[PDB]
């Protein structure tokens, strides 16, 4: 019946969506991290080559 009663109700719905979306990511899994490591090493190999220049 009050303005607060509906605002606070809306806030919880936004937070539930935030939690649900991240959880979907958690259970999907990620491959970004092991690819990122390949990029870091990939840099290291050519850092020596850069150093000669």
């Amino acid at each position: 019946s009050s303005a607060t009663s509906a605002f606070e109700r809306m806030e919880n719905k936004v937070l539930d969506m935030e939690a649900t979306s991240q959880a979907a990511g958690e259970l999907a899994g990620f491959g970004i991290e092991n690819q990122f490591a390949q990029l870091e090493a990939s840099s290291g190999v050519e850092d020596e080559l850069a150093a000669l220049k």
Partner: protein, 54 residues
Amino acid sequence: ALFDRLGRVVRANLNDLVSKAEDPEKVLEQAVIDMQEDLVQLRQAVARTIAEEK
């Protein structure tokens, strides 16, 4: 006993008929497809429970 027998007979004739309509290659393919859709919904079901954990 008596009605119980006849009601089994009705089921049994239907059971044979549907098994004939089950081709093995197509039915197998379709079942794997169903299971994959089901798996996605189940992953989301777990995710919405994990949401309240957070």
